[PDB]
Amino acid sequence: VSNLTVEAFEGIGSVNPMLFYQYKVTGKGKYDNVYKIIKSARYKMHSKNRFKPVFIKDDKLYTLEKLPDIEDLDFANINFVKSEVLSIEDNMSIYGEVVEYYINLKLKKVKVLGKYPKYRINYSKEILSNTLLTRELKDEFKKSNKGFNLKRKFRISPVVNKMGKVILYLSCSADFSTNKNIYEMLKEGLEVEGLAVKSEWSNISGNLVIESVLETKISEPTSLGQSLIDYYKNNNQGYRVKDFTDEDLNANIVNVRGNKKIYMYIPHALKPIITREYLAKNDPEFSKEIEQLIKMNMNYRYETLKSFVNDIGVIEELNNLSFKNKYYEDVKLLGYSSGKIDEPVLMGAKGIIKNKMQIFSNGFYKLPEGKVRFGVLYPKEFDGVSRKAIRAIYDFSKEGKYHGESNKYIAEHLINVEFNPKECIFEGYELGDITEYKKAALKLNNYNNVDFVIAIVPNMSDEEIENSYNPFKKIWAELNLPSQMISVKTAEIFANSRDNTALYYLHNIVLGILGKIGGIPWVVKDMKGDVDCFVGLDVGTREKGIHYPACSVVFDKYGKLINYYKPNIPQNGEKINTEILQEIFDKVLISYEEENGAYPKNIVIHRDGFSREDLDWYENYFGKKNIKFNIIEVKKSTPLKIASINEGNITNPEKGSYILRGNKAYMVTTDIKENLGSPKPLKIEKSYGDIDMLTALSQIYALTQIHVGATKSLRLPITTGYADKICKAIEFIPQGRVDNRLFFL
DNA sequence: TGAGGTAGTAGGTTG
């Protein structure tokens, strides 16, 4: 009965064709090939009007209400040339943006009381609500005494239908904004360079990372041929310059990058972005207040968007268009298909397991071998604490958790290690300069038989402790010494241990120390399809082209072993060409040859958000390598979210259920109860391959289940998740480019 | 950093 529905809405009416004052871009100056010029000229025309909507074709610029003037800026000349009512089916995104603009106009006049209104409107894709609906539906706007307003960011996405119907894909998010501005913080004498900055005079052209405060005066002429206020006064945006004084224009223009070119903004227009973590740092109790409000389950999001579409109401400008007040009872009416895939059984050493708990009763599937002997590096003021902790770790690693060496859930000799406190070494470090931690790690290196240090770091809770996790990782990753550090907090847990949370921590940390060496605890008994090998692909963005940093080729259909290969790129400036990918898959093939001796017949490849530009290379190469294969894209961050729908109630979806359109699939992987928010599902589509998507989803969900670094499962698959975690710890690769051991846990 | 969730990120680019 568990039916599923994405966060979207049905339009009641049907839109009509309407007359469009179409404009043609004509090139001006040395900016020929105007296809790049249109994207700026839209916002330019949208700025010369008071955000009247300007639309995009390859040379045609459609507008509901005419800007009768020609334009004078040097990029293009734009003319009136005669209007025409457009078609419906040819203009899908066009009428979608029509629905966007009229939802903007309708919600511009919405308030809760006689004050600043309910929503803040940029006539754009995103909608900010000035107030915020709570679980008691009271719409109380949230505000700290130090600023830092909490607002809902609504990303609407209407799509029209060729029969005139419209579907409103609707998404709700949280936004953190202060009242303090960049001009105000520059009056504060605070250096703001490198801060991620959004602008509020402008629109969606964001992620505008700031560059440098200049000597440059606003009132004096700049590179743009005018004063920076004259940028707005000569346009119709002079209304934003009707609160300035002589003092308000002394200390002035900052530079800011917009992914293509530096800009010059008024600092008044610029505002800092605020993360969850920036607010939690600066104002922790306000974050404690809004902690209930940031995490949103499907009931809360659904009530939010109920109130939102009730605020929308009807649009009498359009053909009496209104939306429904609830989600769909089916995605098949939307154009998807649903279901819940099983999770296949897993297996370790002894055989098929029932859960990820009893793997320690049933032994680890893969062990690196060589009887690693761990050494320990501890803070000197926690000596007996460290002794009890490592004693617990080693005794659970061989016999059991308590003094009562439990075999109710634990088998003997789960990892071949030897630790005599008399023989094997454990040495202390005192807190201080980073040079001391380096001397301690190097002193550890001076001994022999110290393979796989297990150290103890102070807490990240106490900020005034300068805990040496990162220097220990750097020095021990310079060597081939895998590491596993623990907090002094969990060290006190191991010391003051009477309940049975200690076994949970020990399950967790033993999976960690197994993963740091080349050992695999449990793998899949049976996949569905006939794939032989798994290859993971991430993004690097070293250049905005075909950029690719690192691969993690999971060996078998079992997943029974895992290789990762970091192609140490020839010096940066060398081409990012698929010759790199040739090296990658040759390494993959020889790796599968060392593991099996036979060529893998079928390989699925999981790529990240770097686009579908080079499928033909994989085609030609694997055709010459005579091997059928699959390529399935995994996008880790999607705005779209899936809600399990009962009779009328809206719960979070149970894990392992999917939403499927032909070669575009959504599914949920994690299990999140209602107290912790929403599950962020996966965006999954097959670029090229042969298998049905159900087999791919079953394989990739069992591939989210098996994992080497933790007890409970993950959101990401093993492939792109492990590749991305390698892509995080770039300075932490032991530079040999290929290891069976996984440092990055 | 016991581990994992969440939340945060814009759609092929816009002084």
PDB file of C-alpha atoms (C1' of nucleotides) in Angstrom, chain A residues 39-40 42-44 46-47 51-52 54 120-126 197-208 237 240 263 265 269, chain B residues 11 14-15:
ATOM      1  CA  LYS A  39      22.427  35.371 -21.722  1.00  0.00           C
ATOM      2  CA  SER A  40      23.652  38.780 -20.577  1.00  0.00           C
ATOM      3  CA  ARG A  42      18.294  39.101 -21.174  1.00  0.00           C
ATOM      4  CA  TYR A  43      19.251  40.344 -17.721  1.00  0.00           C
ATOM      5  CA  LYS A  44      20.163  43.719 -19.213  1.00  0.00           C
ATOM      6  CA  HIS A  46      15.220  42.683 -17.524  1.00  0.00           C
ATOM      7  CA  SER A  47      17.113  45.403 -15.650  1.00  0.00           C
ATOM      8  CA  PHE A  51      12.053  42.936 -13.893  1.00  0.00           C
ATOM      9  CA  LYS A  52       9.609  42.443 -16.713  1.00  0.00           C
ATOM     10  CA  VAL A  54      12.620  38.505 -20.947  1.00  0.00           C
ATOM     11  CA  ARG A 120      10.604  38.360  -1.007  1.00  0.00           C
ATOM     12  CA  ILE A 121      10.506  38.256  -4.798  1.00  0.00           C
ATOM     13  CA  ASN A 122      13.316  38.548  -7.328  1.00  0.00           C
ATOM     14  CA  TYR A 123      10.912  37.648 -10.176  1.00  0.00           C
ATOM     15  CA  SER A 124      13.149  34.672 -10.658  1.00  0.00           C
ATOM     16  CA  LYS A 125      13.523  30.940 -10.076  1.00  0.00           C
ATOM     17  CA  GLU A 126      13.887  31.190  -6.292  1.00  0.00           C
ATOM     18  CA  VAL A 197      28.612  36.377  -1.476  1.00  0.00           C
ATOM     19  CA  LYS A 198      25.112  36.526  -2.895  1.00  0.00           C
ATOM     20  CA  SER A 199      23.665  39.785  -4.192  1.00  0.00           C
ATOM     21  CA  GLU A 200      20.137  41.001  -3.602  1.00  0.00           C
ATOM     22  CA  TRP A 201      19.926  43.772  -6.187  1.00  0.00           C
ATOM     23  CA  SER A 202      20.552  41.100  -8.814  1.00  0.00           C
ATOM     24  CA  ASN A 203      19.090  37.642  -9.345  1.00  0.00           C
ATOM     25  CA  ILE A 204      20.099  33.998 -10.013  1.00  0.00           C
ATOM     26  CA  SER A 205      23.562  35.026 -11.351  1.00  0.00           C
ATOM     27  CA  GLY A 206      25.065  33.969  -8.058  1.00  0.00           C
ATOM     28  CA  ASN A 207      27.781  31.997  -6.277  1.00  0.00           C
ATOM     29  CA  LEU A 208      29.617  35.294  -6.595  1.00  0.00           C
ATOM     30  CA  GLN A 237      17.518  50.726 -11.402  1.00  0.00           C
ATOM     31  CA  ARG A 240      18.009  51.371  -5.451  1.00  0.00           C
ATOM     32  CA  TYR A 263      32.441  42.172 -11.384  1.00  0.00           C
ATOM     33  CA  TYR A 265      29.318  45.726  -7.203  1.00  0.00           C
ATOM     34  CA  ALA A 269      24.009  45.233  -2.900  1.00  0.00           C
TER      35      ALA A 269
ATOM     36  C1'  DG B  11      20.730  22.768 -13.596  1.00  0.00           C
ATOM     37  C1'  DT B  14      23.732  36.015 -17.021  1.00  0.00           C
ATOM     38  C1'  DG B  15      28.456  44.017 -15.356  1.00  0.00           C
TER      39       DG B  15
END
